[PDB]
Design an enzyme around this catalytic site. Structure first.
Site, PDB file in Angstrom:
ATOM      1  N   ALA A 187      29.362  61.159  36.739  1.00  0.00           N
ATOM      2  CA  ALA A 187      28.386  61.595  37.728  1.00  0.00           C
ATOM      3  C   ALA A 187      27.126  62.070  37.018  1.00  0.00           C
ATOM      4  O   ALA A 187      27.183  62.973  36.176  1.00  0.00           O
ATOM      5  CB  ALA A 187      28.968  62.707  38.596  1.00  0.00           C
ATOM      6  N   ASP A 188      25.991  61.464  37.355  1.00  0.00           N
ATOM      7  CA  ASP A 188      24.722  61.816  36.734  1.00  0.00           C
ATOM      8  C   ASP A 188      24.137  63.042  37.437  1.00  0.00           C
ATOM      9  O   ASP A 188      24.802  63.716  38.227  1.00  0.00           O
ATOM     10  CB  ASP A 188      23.771  60.621  36.759  1.00  0.00           C
ATOM     11  CG  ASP A 188      23.417  60.178  38.166  1.00  0.00           C
ATOM     12  OD1 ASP A 188      23.850  60.838  39.134  1.00  0.00           O
ATOM     13  OD2 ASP A 188      22.703  59.165  38.303  1.00  0.00           O
ATOM     14  N   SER A 189      22.871  63.346  37.143  1.00  0.00           N
ATOM     15  CA  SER A 189      22.230  64.517  37.733  1.00  0.00           C
ATOM     16  C   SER A 189      22.284  64.465  39.255  1.00  0.00           C
ATOM     17  O   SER A 189      22.708  65.427  39.909  1.00  0.00           O
ATOM     18  CB  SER A 189      20.783  64.610  37.250  1.00  0.00           C
ATOM     19  OG  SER A 189      20.052  63.449  37.611  1.00  0.00           O
ATOM     20  N   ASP A 193      24.237  62.715  41.216  1.00  0.00           N
ATOM     21  CA  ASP A 193      25.603  62.774  41.724  1.00  0.00           C
ATOM     22  C   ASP A 193      26.150  64.194  41.668  1.00  0.00           C
ATOM     23  O   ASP A 193      26.852  64.631  42.587  1.00  0.00           O
ATOM     24  CB  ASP A 193      26.495  61.817  40.937  1.00  0.00           C
ATOM     25  CG  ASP A 193      26.236  60.365  41.283  1.00  0.00           C
ATOM     26  OD1 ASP A 193      26.411  59.992  42.461  1.00  0.00           O
ATOM     27  OD2 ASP A 193      25.858  59.594  40.375  1.00  0.00           O
TER      28      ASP A 193
END
Lengths: 43, 72, 50, 50
Positions: free
Chosen positions: B33-35, B37
């Site tokens: 999960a990125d920023s 997400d």
């Protein structure tokens, strides 16, 4: 804005408190000055 | 128990199943999960519990376990 | 930010074409000179197969 | 005036609440689509990042 409003409420209450004290003082001063006017008329 | 909320929501927000998440891992890099997400995950957690989490506290959920630590 | 934003789409299109091209080949390119040397190897294979 | 701004805060809070439901419900579907798309479409065919 939520936190700003909370802080502003606190400050506002403080100023209201000190003005309440000055209102009481003003009534006391009016009593004293009523006596003073009576004294002027008596003299 | 009540943690079933978090351990459910996390998966529903990250595509993994309930048991996939490991307490030792970190959302930012070990879950994919990125920023955006992670912002979505924390904000969904906020919605589910009908509460609020400021930015400073919200930023302290990079690890899996933290999601329950602030909750319970 | 405005400069970078104006520049971005062209670079992205170029990168997609480059990735498709090099993936279509066996070797991976990294620089202009590298592409040129790959040209030369391609010519040699032409003139052997022919 | 500040009490009326507090009531503005309440109105803004319910607006935020609406937006929040929108976001979570949208992600629920993004999940499914990106599950199915992993049949090599997303790699470069559908994800036209230009």
């Amino acid at each position: 804005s939520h936190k700003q409003l909370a802080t502003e409420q606190y400050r506002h209450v403080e100023m209201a408190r000190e003005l309440a004290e000055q209102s009481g003082a003003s009534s006391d001063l009016e009593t004293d000055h009523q006596a003073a006017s009576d004294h002027l008329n008596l003299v | 128990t009540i943690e079933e909320r978090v351990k459910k929501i996390i998966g529903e927000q990250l595509g993994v199943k309930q048991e996939e998440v490991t307490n030792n891992a970190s959302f930012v890099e070990d879950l994919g999960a990125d920023s955006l997400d992670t912002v979505e995950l924390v904000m969904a957690l906020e919605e589910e519990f009908d509460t609020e989490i400021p930015d400073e506290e919200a930023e302290k959920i990079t690890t899996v376990q933290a999601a329950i630590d602030y909750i319970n | 930010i405005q400069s970078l934003t104006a520049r971005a789409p062209v670079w992205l299109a170029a990168q997609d074409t480059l990735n498709q091209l090099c993936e279509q080949s066996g070797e991976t390119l990294a620089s202009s000179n590298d592409v040129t040397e790959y040209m030369q190897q391609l010519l040699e294979r032409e003139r052997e197969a022919t | 005036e500040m009490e009326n701004v507090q009531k503005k805060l309440r109105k803004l809070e319910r607006d935020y609440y609406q937006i929040r439901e929108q976001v979570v419900s949208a992600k629920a579907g993004w999940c499914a689509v990106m599950r199915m798309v992993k049949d090599n479409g997303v790699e470069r065919r559908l994800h036209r990042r230009e």
